[PDB]
Symmetry: D2
């Protein structure tokens, strides 16, 4: 439809962590039906970021997930109008981020307007001390609630010198028009920073995602 | 630098469920009486589509009556000032976080506030504007990592009865080294004294007093 | 059926991290003064391998001084009595839940208590016995679904400084229809007044008073 | 080793929900390497259960999960000594259960001693009103913490007449001897009540579970 095998992405994120503001812009491309995407991100304000870049990366579109034909695709159906999402990310040490993304479509380019805010990260914690390595792969659980789509996922950051730092995501996705609602399902994800410069002013980010129905029977 | 009568000026920028807004306010308070009041005007995003009550505690613990026997982290922090960060986790999964950077210009406190909220259910009391007021509360304050924490069980009274619970966790950070208090309490009571129909204009009042709980 | 001096008898059975134990206790209290005390003996599973403090608030809100202007859900509930259920969620992921079924025999309250806790980290303050005492607290009470709820931000003082936070959520259920109170508070202060080396024997005291917060 | 392709199971659970005590016994069999098991459960005390049987079912052994050779199997290694687990199950309406299981091995029979306790379930909620249909399939996230094994999972109960009732599990698994510790990994699960009589005094329960490493790259 309005969706093509190769799509472009443009974004601006504005935000703050522990009261310190920053802004990031990004350009990328993705393959909606392969569930793969990548982009280049540049910090424009507030650099160099004094916190772990990893907390931001999942804020940078479930349109980029490979949906089998037997699972309703809330996201691909929502276009050209698009959809928005809201997310809380609650870290096990009391750090908490919340983010929004309003996703629109211009030609073959998705446009993100993102807001990201985080508070209560301990000064000596892995986020403020930049001790994170990457997010582990994950499996998001998606279900309908109040006529919109919810997605929850147990996330974990691998830490420098071993161990994990846990975060629970609760996302609400809201199509901008009426679409068919899916049954309970899953999306496996794996997000990776493929490259970055020393202070993360420049980051090349990649994600691979595939929908499924879990173990049979 | 702390006078019995002080002025207040603030600007809040924020968003609730992705919907941006901005509010400015002017007020006065009596730091030693633990009382303050202000007038707030919505400047952008009005008429606000969510319960104004969720915003009100974001609109300064310097306005709390501290007894002599309890260290006052807040009054000590001036003229440099202090900042706070707050999570406000509601029982239905709605969640707000806010920050306030507080500085002092003459006899006027200046607030720069950011407020963000997500995951409020469309049929919940916040988006449906079914709140009446916050109940009075007692905040529990304790030192952690060289800064001051304050946690409080909050409750909104609901139209036609019952309550809607919210857990506050605040971190307060003096901009200079100050003496740190022992575990203590602050009783609060915040009230919208008047407002126009869609809350474009709101007169807000708070009264707060520190104590050490049961002997 | 409520006398100025009342007796108490209890048995608690429980487990912490899969390790079972049992404790019995005898005491006396003054319902109208909001004071009580008791002596507790570990009968099984001793010496307890976890901080005794996590148990103590499980060991009756009838022992709270209620002003005339606040409905007393608890004193009304007798002679039939009431039960409570409680979750106690600690900041490091440790979590306890407890129940108490309270009946009255003559001038003696009888408690049947179940206490269970899991997920306490081996190097955390509970398994390492690094707690000193609970701080005083203010519980917030409100009606929900025709029964009484009580939530409280609790904190344990830690050996060598700092605090370890726990969130209590309690549901109280009268065994007969009683008049329901308006939103209110109960201040608390619980203290182990004495104990032997491994807490096989503990003398415990609590003082509690209801109020309506800042006017 | 001490583990065979076909193993037996015996259990006793004692517990309480909202202060009301009950007890359940069970006999079953499982295939550790196929990640499949089934059992028959009988309520012995406190019947007929006045709450949704579904809240109990996951308390009724990760030995019954198919582990690939490239993922360390904490559970199979822990025998013959065995291991224990502790679990909190936090429901979105404030209901909360916690359970323990001490698992030992006698011959070719696992023996469970289970404790289950739940409180704060609303009188008009799906648990006390018995409005649950089944658990959805799930993906548990497993990671090492403090030299033992953690497993967290986003769970959901399908509800009578549509929608879902969410529960977050946090489990700690503790081998009774030193074993090799795994890297971060996943276990897909699907638990099902295959049959039951009217008041659930008798229940035939089945689970299928398989370990994996999530999306590649």
């Amino acid at each position: 439809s309005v969706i093509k095998p190769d799509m472009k992405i443009k974004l601006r994120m504005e935000g703050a962590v522990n009261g310190h503001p920053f802004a990031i812009e990004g350009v990328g491309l993705g393959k909606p039906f392969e569930g793969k995407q990548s982009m280049d991100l540049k910090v424009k304000e507030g650099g160099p970021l004094p916190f772990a870049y990893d907390i931001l990366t999942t804020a940078f579109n479930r349109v980029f997930a490979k949906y089998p034909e037997n699972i309703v695709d809330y996201f691909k159906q929502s276009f050209p109008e698009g959809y928005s999402w809201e997310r809380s990310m609650s870290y096990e040490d009391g750090g908490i981020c919340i983010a929004t993304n309003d996703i629109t479509l211009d030609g073959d380019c998705y446009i993100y307007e993102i807001r990201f805010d985080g508070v209560n990260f301990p000064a000596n914690g892995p986020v403020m001390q930049k001790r994170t390595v990457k997010w582990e792969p994950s499996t998001e659980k998606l279900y309908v609630r109040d006529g919109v789509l919810k997605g929850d996922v147990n996330m974990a950051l691998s830490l420098e010198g071993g161990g994990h730092y846990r975060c629970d995501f609760k996302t609400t996705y809201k199509a901008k028009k009426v679409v068919q609602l899916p049954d309970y399902h899953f999306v496996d994800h794996h997000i990776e920073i493929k490259s970055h410069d020393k202070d993360y002013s420049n980051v090349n980010l990649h994600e691979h995602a595939e929908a499924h129905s879990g173990l049979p029977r």
